[PDB]
Write a protein that binds this ligand. Structure first.
Ligand SMILES: [Mg+2]
Ligand SMILES: [Mg+2]
Ligand SMILES: [Mg+2]
Ligand SMILES: [Mg+2]
Ligand SMILES: [Mg+2]
Ligand SMILES: [Mg+2]
Ligand SMILES: [Mg+2]
Ligand SMILES: [Mg+2]
Ligand SMILES: [Mg+2]
Ligand SMILES: [Mg+2]
Ligand SMILES: [Mg+2]
Ligand SMILES: [Mg+2]
Ligand SMILES: [Mg+2]
Ligand SMILES: [Mg+2]
Ligand SMILES: [Mg+2]
Ligand SMILES: [Mg+2]
Ligand SMILES: [Mg+2]
Ligand SMILES: [Mg+2]
Ligand SMILES: [Mg+2]
Ligand SMILES: [Mg+2]
Ligand SMILES: [Mg+2]
Ligand SMILES: [Mg+2]
Ligand SMILES: [Mg+2]
Ligand SMILES: [Mg+2]
Lengths: 99, 116, 208, 83, 127, 151, 100
RNA sequence: CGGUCCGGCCGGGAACUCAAAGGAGACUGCCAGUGAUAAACUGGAGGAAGGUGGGGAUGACGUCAAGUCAUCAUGGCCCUUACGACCAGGGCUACACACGUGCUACAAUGGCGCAUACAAAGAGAAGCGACCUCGCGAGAGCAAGCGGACCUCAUAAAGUGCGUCGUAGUCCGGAUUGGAGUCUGCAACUCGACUCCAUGAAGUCGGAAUCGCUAGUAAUCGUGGAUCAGAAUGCCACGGUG
């Protein structure tokens, strides 16, 4: 089997990518497991916004790292290579786990 | 009820009343009674005098009242005579271990000394 | 420091990021330096070109720089003359194979970075600042902006008491989160000091 | 303090000077900026001028001065009192 | 034939399964006297069962995760009331009056910048 | 507050007796959010309190509660050159709240060892009508008729 | 920051990467309990002979745009000021003002 | 459901918890009373939520010639064999004193010892580092697993149960100091943190004065992160009890 991990910042841009990567192995291979969502990492940040002296004046940022786990049950011959030849948009990081 | 030179209260338990000895604490009092086979919840009352003789020998293994104060004063006066930084702190009355002297040095400096 | 930056507060709602890539923490800050050096270089190189927004994107360890400009003719030159010259120096800086795409800016009077640089270029050659602010507002409301606010600040006409001035025509709702406020900021390095120029342009509300 | 498994510490440029002055047998004051070097037992009886930030104060080495460092015998802050 | 309800509290999440029986309370494979040592928490898990006269009427199997002693006890009451309305549906007219069907939405407030706690501001001094 | 009269929150009854008032008493005793200890102290002090009296724990608590309830308190108004302590009638909710505060406050000041020993002795004296808590009841009443001219 | 202070910072990265293999060689000797003590004494005297700027604890993470020694963030490589100027113009992907 | 090493562990099961993505939901929308036939207000009705449900972000024109030329940028002035540059050592940590902000206390709603229950939110590759062994201990050795809903940091503490102290400067309090160490780091003297043994100050609730807080709030209890080789009682987050 091939575990595929999709990491992104825009959840619309990963769902645009997640439904895209299903249709490749749905046509070529068989039994795409599902677009199983994982917990989202929220890496917060907090900085002083004044240049010299205001300790109480701050911004609070975050980065939401959206995760998607899609498994492929029966890898055919076209399942590996045609999805390897397939590339996705930037912002999405794909990560295959062969076996 | 008289161990290592000084007396020891009878109404207290065993580990606590041992700590009146200058040189033992709650750790070493457990180390004394374990080597004597004496339970810690008993008092200095209702002890056999043979048990107290066992108690005096275990305390005599370590450094106590008359020895320890001499050793502590010898270590401080060793620093006094060298003139190191720790010696100067010991003789200016200032804190030795690198604490702040700008504020809150009242243990070594005593109470406040007003500017007159 | 009263007002929030209108671009940065709208980044999840109606504004896109100018860099849309992904990396882990191991390779993050090197990319952010790499994104900074090419925006530094291209702004210095395409100064005469009316460049507004340099969008950087890197899939599969290959940078793709999308230059927004009011005229691509000075950016391209002959067909693959200056773009190809600029593509090989990005790859020297980014360390990856590069690619330059050019998205043309229709209606350059309705783009805040172009308007702010037009005010700055006028102020640098010693025009009256109030005349420059009028024409920047009149051109945008004619071309169809629902509201523009411009603002210059400090050492105006060489006066020793620095003050700020601002004009406004049409409605510019800054507190409305779904408002398309095009905001960007320029600086004029005059002989009497530095004059900062801010310009807000309201296009309309995105009804998502 | 330092770990026992690392042993003591001394500058190499100091330790070569100690090795020279033992064999040469000279009692010149050795000016030294190594305030962080532990004194060794072969250093006993030598005038070694430890720096303090401003000048070099000479330190005669005693038997009791072995397990310390040279900076303890060169005080860096001059303080006499407020009144 | 089991009847289910989810109750939630501060950060708790109860899973209550109602079967008709004798009144056997099992929480995380432990008895009620075993699980909640606090007698106040033993009351609130019995309040809707004592609101109606159905202490002896039904057994129940409960799992709960997250939160504290009173937090897990609070979610168990809100799950039993969620499951008894699946059992009868005539009890919503009474359990609303008991204030039980309302999920208490009192989460803890986040610590804010400048403030030492959710609402405690640091000590003020003019001079 | 200035704008509105508020809607007060609902209190649980106690687990042992079902009394709303006794659970209002364990909250006044409670410090630092430790209700479990304050639940134990009240249930230990009221255990020996009914032991000394043979009545119900709920019934004998109210007897000590009856002899510390103030009837008229005063409050500062100061419309002239000095402070006017005007004797204002106290509503029956605050009558019950001031009483339980005074019993707890007197029970802090006793010299007994256990807090349940400090509180059961104070309740047994309040039903006997002595102690600091009824002495606080007197000084409120003594200041009342010493200012009855103001109304 | 100064030009020289940034120049000093680049030198402390190059020297810390130059002798990096040799410093781990000596620390393997000194930390080994199963070693000759004259070697462990020779290793700690050898480690003095290396330049001081070769240590990884010697360089300080400055802002990569301005050289500011304080307010640094390791994920962005910038100080707290230049993070805020970049985050508002959207040069940092996926970074926006949070509220929760 | 079946099976068991009684462990969701293992066949499995997709319900449930949960994880996100999309959507529904609350609008004075309805009912009654008041109101100037209005705005609106009061009440109850359903409902998880009722009138802004709770919390955050969001800070008008301006004010204080407010702050910052030491993040950066920049007009003008100044320095250019020094006001620039390099290195070692020192200092930024001094100490008759005055103030701010905090931490721990002055104990019995507690200290202590044993046993035991319940969290959330995070970080991790020059990193997090199980298990096992050694050490009283901080730690050391060997060393899995992990770029992480998997593994690790990491056993939550307050609590409860039992025993203990029994009002004392105490089995309260922990300063100070001596001795012995560990770890980080070229290097812990000035000037680090931590551990062990010993030491056991002041302090018995605080003058005039003064601060915070309206509900999961104050109070209290632990947890994590940023910075960082190491180095918080600060700061930023998180849940428990309440
Ligand atoms: Mg002692
Ligand atoms: Mg101790
Ligand atoms: Mg603001
Ligand atoms: Mg502050
Ligand atoms: Mg004051
Ligand atoms: Mg202030
Ligand atoms: Mg410079
Ligand atoms: Mg450093
Ligand atoms: Mg109603
Ligand atoms: Mg209603
Ligand atoms: Mg608003
Ligand atoms: Mg000024
Ligand atoms: Mg230097
Ligand atoms: Mg300082
Ligand atoms: Mg960390
Ligand atoms: Mg062991
Ligand atoms: Mg306990
Ligand atoms: Mg006890
Ligand atoms: Mg103690
Ligand atoms: Mg005293
Ligand atoms: Mg006392
Ligand atoms: Mg309020
Ligand atoms: Mg650290
Ligand atoms: Mg809290």
């Amino acid at each position: 089997r091939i575990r595929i991990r999709l990491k992104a910042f825009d959840h619309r841009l990963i769902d645009q990518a997640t439904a895209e990567i299903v249709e490749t192995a749905k046509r070529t291979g068989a039994q795409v497991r599902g677009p199983i969502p994982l917990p989202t990492r929220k890496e917060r940040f907090t900085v002083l916004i004044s240049p010299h002296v205001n300790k109480d004046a701050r911004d609070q940022y975050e980065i939401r790292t959206h995760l998607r786990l899609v498994d492929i049950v029966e890898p055919t011959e076209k399942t590996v290579d045609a999805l390897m030849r397939l590339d996705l948009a930037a912002g999405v990081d794909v990560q295959i786990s062969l076996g | 009820a008289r161990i290592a030179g000084i007396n020891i209260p009878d109404h207290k338990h065993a580990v606590i009343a041992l700590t009146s000895i200058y040189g033992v604490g709650k750790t070493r009092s457990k180390a004394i009674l374990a080597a004597a086979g004496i339970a810690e919840d008993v008092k200095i009352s209702e002890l056999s005098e043979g048990q107290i003789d066992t108690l005096r020998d275990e305390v005599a293994k370590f450094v106590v009242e008359g020895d320890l104060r001499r050793e502590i004063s010898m270590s401080i006066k060793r620093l006094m005579d060298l003139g190191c930084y720790r010696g100067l702190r010991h003789r200016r009355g200032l804190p030795v271990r690198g604490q702040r002297t700008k504020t809150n040095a009242r243990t070594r400096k005593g109470p406040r000394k007003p500017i007159k | 420091g009263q007002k929030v930056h209108p671009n940065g507060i709208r980044l999840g709602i109606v504004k896109p990021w100018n860099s849309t890539w992904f990396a882990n923490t191991k390779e993050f800050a090197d990319n952010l330096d790499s994104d900074f050096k090419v925006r530094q270089y291209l702004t210095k190189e395409l100064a005469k070109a009316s460049v507004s927004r340099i969008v950087i994107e890197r899939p599969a360890k290959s940078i793709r720089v999308t230059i927004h400009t009011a005229r691509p003719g000075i950016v391209i030159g002959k067909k693959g003359e200056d773009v190809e010259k600029l593509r090989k120096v990005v790859a020297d800086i980014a360390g990856v194979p590069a690619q330059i795409n050019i998205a043309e800016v229709r209606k350059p009077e309705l783009d805040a970075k172009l308007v702010a640089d037009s005010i700055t270029s006028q102020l640098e050659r010693r025009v009256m600042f109030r005349r420059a602010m009028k024409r920047a507002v009149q051109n945008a409301m004619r071309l169809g902006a629902k509201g523009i606010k411009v603002e210059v600040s400090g050492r105006l006409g060489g006066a020793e008491i620095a003050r700020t001035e601002w004009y406004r025509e049409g409605r510019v709702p800054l507190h409305t989160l779904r408002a398309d406020i095009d905001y960007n900021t320029s600086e004029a390095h005059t002989t009497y000091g530095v004059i900062g120029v801010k310009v807000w342009i309201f296009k309309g509300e995105i009804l998502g | 303090p330092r770990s026992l498994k690392k042993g003591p510490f001394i500058d190499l440029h100091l330790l070569k000077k100690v090795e020279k002055a033992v064999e040469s047998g000279d009692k010149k004051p050795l000016r030294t900026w190594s305030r962080r070097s532990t004194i060794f037992p072969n250093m006993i009886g030598l005038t070694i001028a430890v720096h303090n930030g401003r000048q070099h104060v000479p330190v005669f080495v005693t038997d009791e001065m072995v397990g310390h460092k040279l900076g303890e015998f060169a005080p860096t802050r001059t303080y006499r009192g407020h009144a | 034939n089991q009847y289910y309800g989810t109750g939630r509290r501060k950060s708790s999440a109860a899973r209550v399964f109602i079967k008709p029986g004798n009144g056997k309370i099992v929480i995380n494979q432990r008895s009620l006297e075993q699980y909640f040592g606090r007698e106040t928490a033993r009351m609130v898990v019995r309040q809707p069962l004592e609101l109606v006269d159905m202490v002896e009427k039904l057994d129940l199997y409960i799992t709960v995760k997250g939160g504290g002693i009173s937090g897990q006890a609070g979610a168990i009451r809100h799950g039993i009331t969620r499951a008894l309305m699946e059992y009868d549906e005539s009890l919503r007219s009474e359990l609303r009056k008991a204030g039980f069907v309302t999920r208490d939405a009192r989460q803890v407030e986040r610590k804010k910048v400048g403030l030492r706690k959710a609402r405690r501001r640091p000590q003020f001094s003019k001079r | 507050p200035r704008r509105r009269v508020i809607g007060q929150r609902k209190i649980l009854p106690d687990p042992k007796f079902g009394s709303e008032l006794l659970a209002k008493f364990v909250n006044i005793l409670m410090v630092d959010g430790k209700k479990s200890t304050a639940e134990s102290i009240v249930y230990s002090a009221l255990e020996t309190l009914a032991q000394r009296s043979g009545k119900s724990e709920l019934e004998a608590f109210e007897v000590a509660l009856e002899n510390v309830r103030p009837t008229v308190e005063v409050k500062s108004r100061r419309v002239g050159g000095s402070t006017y302590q005007v004797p204002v009638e106290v509503r029956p909710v605050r009558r019950n709240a001031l009483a339980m505060r005074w019993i707890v406050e007197a029970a802090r000041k006793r010299g007994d060892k256990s807090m349940a020993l400090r509180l059961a002795n104070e309740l047994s004296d309040a039903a006997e009508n002595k102690g600091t808590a009824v002495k606080k009841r007197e000084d409120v009443h003594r200041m009342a008729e010493a200012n009855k001219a103001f109304a | 920051a100064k030009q020289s202070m940034k120049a000093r910072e680049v030198k402390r990265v190059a020297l810390a990467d130059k002798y990096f293999a040799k410093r781990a060689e000596l620390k393997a000797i000194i930390s080994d309990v199963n070693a000759s003590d004259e070697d462990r004494w020779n290793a700690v005297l050898k480690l003095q002979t290396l330049p001081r700027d070769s240590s990884p604890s010697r360089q300080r993470n400055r802002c990569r745009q301005t050289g500011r020694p304080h307010g640094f963030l390791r994920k962005f490589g910038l100080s707290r000021i230049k993070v805020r100027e970049a985050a508002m113009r959207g040069e940092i992907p996926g970074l926006k003002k949070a509220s929760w």
